[PDB]
Design an enzyme around this catalytic site. Structure first.
Site, PDB file in Angstrom:
ATOM      1  N   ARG A 208      38.554  38.924  42.252  1.00 16.05           N
ATOM      2  CA  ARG A 208      39.830  39.303  41.647  1.00 16.05           C
ATOM      3  C   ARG A 208      40.071  38.579  40.319  1.00 16.05           C
ATOM      4  O   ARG A 208      40.759  39.111  39.461  1.00 16.05           O
ATOM      5  CB  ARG A 208      40.990  39.072  42.615  1.00 16.05           C
ATOM      6  CG  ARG A 208      40.926  39.942  43.858  1.00 16.05           C
ATOM      7  CD  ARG A 208      42.130  39.700  44.735  1.00 16.05           C
ATOM      8  NE  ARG A 208      42.160  38.331  45.239  1.00 16.05           N
ATOM      9  CZ  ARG A 208      43.166  37.802  45.921  1.00 16.05           C
ATOM     10  NH1 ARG A 208      44.265  38.517  46.163  1.00 16.05           N
ATOM     11  NH2 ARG A 208      43.066  36.551  46.363  1.00 16.05           N
TER      12      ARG A 208
ATOM     13  N   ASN B 119      44.281  41.166  48.451  1.00 10.15           N
ATOM     14  CA  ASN B 119      43.357  40.901  49.556  1.00 10.15           C
ATOM     15  C   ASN B 119      43.915  41.473  50.844  1.00 10.15           C
ATOM     16  O   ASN B 119      45.038  41.146  51.234  1.00 10.15           O
ATOM     17  CB  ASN B 119      43.128  39.398  49.746  1.00 10.15           C
ATOM     18  CG  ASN B 119      41.965  38.872  48.922  1.00 10.15           C
ATOM     19  OD1 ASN B 119      41.451  39.569  48.050  1.00 10.15           O
ATOM     20  ND2 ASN B 119      41.530  37.651  49.212  1.00 10.15           N
TER      21      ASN B 119
END
Length: 90
Positions: A19, A37
Site C-alpha cells: 500500500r 486491508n
C-alpha cells in the site's frame, strides 16, 4: 475524463509495503481514494482521478513492490464522485 476505479488485490500483499508503493504512485498521478486491508489478507483499492492516471495506477497495482506477491487483481470502473481529498490507508 474522470473515473472511479475499484481493485481488489490477492496474494501476499499485507505486511510487504504494497500500500505504500500504491500510495506513492497514486499521489504522483494525482489520484485520491484509499487502500484498505481486508481481514482475509486481500487489499481493496478505491481510486479517483483522470482515466489515464487510473490506467497507470492499475499497472502499479498489478506489479507491486518486489516484496509483494501479487497473484490476482479484479477491477472495475464507476462514476467519479469527487469526494476524496487525499489517498489514505484503512
Amino acid at each position: 475524463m474522470l473515473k472511479r476505479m475499484y481493485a481488489r488485490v490477492y496474494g501476499l500483499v499485507q505486511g510487504v509495503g504494497f500500500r505504500k508503493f500504491v500510495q506513492i504512485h497514486a499521489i504522483r498521478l494525482g489520484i485520491k481514494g484509499y487502500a484498505k486491508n481486508l481481514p482475509d489478507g486481500s487489499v481493496e483499492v478505491v481510486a479517483e482521478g483522470y482515466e489515464e492516471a487510473l490506467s497507470k495506477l492499475l499497472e502499479r497495482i498489478k506489479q507491486g513492490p518486489p516484496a509483494a506477491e501479487v497473484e490476482k487483481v479484479d477491477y472495475s470502473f464507476s462514476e467519479y464522485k469527487g469526494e476524496f481529498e487525499d489517498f489514505e490507508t484503512y
